[PDB]
Amino acid sequence: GLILPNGNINWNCPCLGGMASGPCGEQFKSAFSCFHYSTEEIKGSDCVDQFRAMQECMQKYPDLY
DSSP states (O other): OOBOTTSSBOTTSHHHHHHTSSSTHHHHHHHHHHHHHHOOSSTTTTTHHHHHHHHHHHHHOSSOO
């Protein structure tokens, strides 16, 4: 699926790599890696600061990429 054979996230498939591609893309990558390695259940449950960061970044940066 979306996880590499080395346990990291597969940053080259179109949609998942595309949202990881850009300046706010580092926060998207940090939000997803924190959530994936935490395995808890709810999308971002103990990683919330990186999802809030993704929001403040991308609500200022729309299509200028």
